[PDB]
């Protein structure tokens, strides 16, 4: 007969006698992580990384990576008797001749986008909140290599089906950019293709880099990345009990094993819907890659789009120093390493210009940092311009503007728009700071007016603190914590009366529940307050 109580202790004693992980399990089962929604943005890039491993292993044992020419002779009727590579036939066999093969193929492209998108969202949490300053410098650098690898790991991914849209990206990037390099540019092209483009060995080299090497590096950097956040006691925002040497949050065993394991079920659930409902890469529409045809356009996925727009906007500037030449494509290869050098080495740029070499464990609220908020949104608005200038064959056609006017709003705007987003965000950030000081000095602006008996429309502020014998409140001190601006958020709304959405509870069971809501939101409030006074 099953028991699951005596068996749970007799097996736990067998682990704790052969091994002894109880003095080490408890120290990582009482680990405290801060509950904040921004601190789950890095988990979206991790939970999409696992789906790319799981859905990748599936179609690894169906895909054939060669470039050998073979006629189709299969099931897709427009592609019959067509000279195609073998990498494009076994990508049309996953989509069409395997049960549930197009689904796993589509989830794997959408998870590749959610991987690269939730890196960029997660970089924007780290940069603006200042989560990189003193101990986390190496975790930025070990971090920011995962962005540079995810650019190239995805770019080596859709190059594998050898599509007509996808093959002209290899001719542009890996054969046009890497052939105009001035020191050696032609020697690097033969060391990558085994000869002139296309060759025969490219897609097998782009298969081993994409399955073994670069996910072997990304998974090894992530293990070095999550160790430096497990063993460096994850940063927190300032607040009531948060005092620069504590971690005020929730533990690992009852909570954060649940809310981080259920969040993995939902991020897999969103990609299950998007990989099922929304078609992603219909590689059967555009034919096989042959160097004598093109499509209506050519553009990468959205993570590699800022490099394509960087090609389109720099004008035809070449030098010709001697009997050699220096083409336009080297301005991107030196303009891609310069962007990557400033993004890897940023925590060492900011401490050189500020002298901020003290140990930081409380996050900066990004309105309190008006320059780095403005330098950041300068760099979003330059990314958002370079990623919209690579799709100006679609802005010209669908939005009806021009094909010549979209480059000149991308050329004039590349200087202007990062310069007028620096101004408006240095002045947005300080103007949020003054909004936090009109709520400390005066109080929360309640809406209710109350005309006085002599005229005198007033506003009836709620002071958020002690009061004077005169009607003015004492001014509080700012402490980096977010201040409430609305009175419903201070619990002045109330409870709608318990019951279902249609039928009420008998109101004896209402007063017993709402009393436990003002005695658990008040026992919690006198718990942080008696701990804040214990520290200071």
């Amino acid at each position: 007969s099953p028991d699951f109580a005596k068996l749970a202790a007799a097996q736990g004693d067998a682990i704790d006698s052969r091994y002894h992980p109880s003095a080490a399990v408890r120290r990582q089962l009482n680990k405290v992580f801060p509950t904040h929604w921004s601190f789950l943005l890095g988990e979206i890039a991790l939970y999409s990384f696992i789906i790319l491993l799981l859905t990748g292993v599936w179609l690894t044992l169906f895909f054939d990576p060669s470039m050998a020419h073979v006629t189709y002779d299969g099931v897709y009727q427009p592609l019959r008797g067509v000279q195609m590579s073998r990498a494009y036939e076994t990508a049309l066999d996953i989509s069409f001749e395997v049960r549930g093969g197009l689904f796993v193929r589509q989830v794997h492209h959408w998870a590749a986008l959610m991987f690269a998108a939730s890196i960029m969202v997660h970089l924007a949490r780290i940069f603006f909140t200042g989560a990189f300053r003193r101990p986390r410098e190496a975790n930025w650098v070990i971090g920011s290599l995962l962005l540079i690898l995810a650019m190239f790991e995805g770019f080596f991914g859709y190059s594998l089906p050898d599509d007509l849209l996808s093959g002209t990206g290899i001719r542009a990037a890996l054969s046009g950019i890497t052939m105009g390099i001035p020191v050696i540019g032609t020697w690097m092209h033969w060391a990558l293709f085994g000869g002139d483009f296309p060759g025969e060995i490219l897609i097998p080299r782009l298969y081993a880099l994409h399955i073994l090497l670069i996910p072997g590096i990304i998974l090894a950097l992530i293990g070095a990345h999550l160790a430096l956040v497990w063993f460096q006691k994850h940063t927190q925002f300032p607040g009531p009990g948060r005092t620069e040497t504590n971690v005020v949050g929730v533990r690992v065993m009852p909570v954060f094993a649940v809310k981080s394991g259920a969040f993995f079920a939902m991020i897999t659930g969103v990609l299950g819907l998007m990989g099922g409902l929304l078609t992603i890469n219909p590689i059967w529409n555009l034919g096989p890659y042959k160097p004598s045809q093109v499509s209506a356009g050519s553009q990468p996925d959205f993570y590699m789009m800022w490099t394509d727009g960087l090609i389109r906007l720099w004008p035809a500037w070449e030098f010709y120093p001697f009997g050699h030449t220096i083409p336009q494509g080297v301005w991107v290869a030196v303009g891609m390493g310069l962007v990557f050098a400033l993004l890897i080495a940023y925590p060492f740029i900011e401490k050189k210009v500020t002298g901020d070499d003290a140990h930081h464990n409380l996050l900066q609220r990004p309105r309190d940092v008006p320059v780095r908020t403005a330098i950041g949104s300068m760099a979003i608005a330059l990314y958002l311009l370079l990623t919209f200038a690579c799709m100006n064959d679609i802005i010209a056609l669908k939005f009806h503007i021009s094909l010549n006017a979209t480059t000149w709003i991308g050329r004039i705007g590349m200087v202007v728009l990062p310069a007028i987003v620096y101004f408006v965000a240095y002045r947005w950030a300080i103007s949020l700071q003054r909004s936090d000081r009109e709520v400390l000095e005066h109080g929360v602006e309640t809406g209710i007016i109350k005309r006085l008996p002599h005229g005198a429309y007033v506003e009836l502020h709620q002071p958020l603190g002690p009061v004077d014998e005169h009607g003015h409140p004492i001014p509080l001190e700012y402490a980096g914590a977010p201040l409430p601006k609305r009175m419903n958020k201070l619990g002045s709304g109330g409870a709608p009366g318990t019951g279902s959405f249609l039928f009420p509870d008998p109101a004896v069971e209402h007063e017993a529940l709402t009393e436990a809501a003002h005695a658990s939101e008040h026992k919690s409030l006198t718990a942080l307050k008696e701990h804040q006074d214990r520290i200071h």
Binding site: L41, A117, K259, M274, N281, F302, I394
Partner: peptide, 30 residues
């Protein structure tokens, strides 16, 4: 109607709104 430009729009306003909007429901605001 296809290509990687509607992939990018349907990622940020569908996939990452429903990934941030879930994270804002699970996590707290402090």
């Amino acid at each position: 109607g296809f290509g990687p430009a509607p992939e990018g729009m349907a990622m940020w306003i569908i996939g990452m709104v429903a990934a941030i909007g879930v994270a804002m429901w699970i996590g707290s605001r402090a």
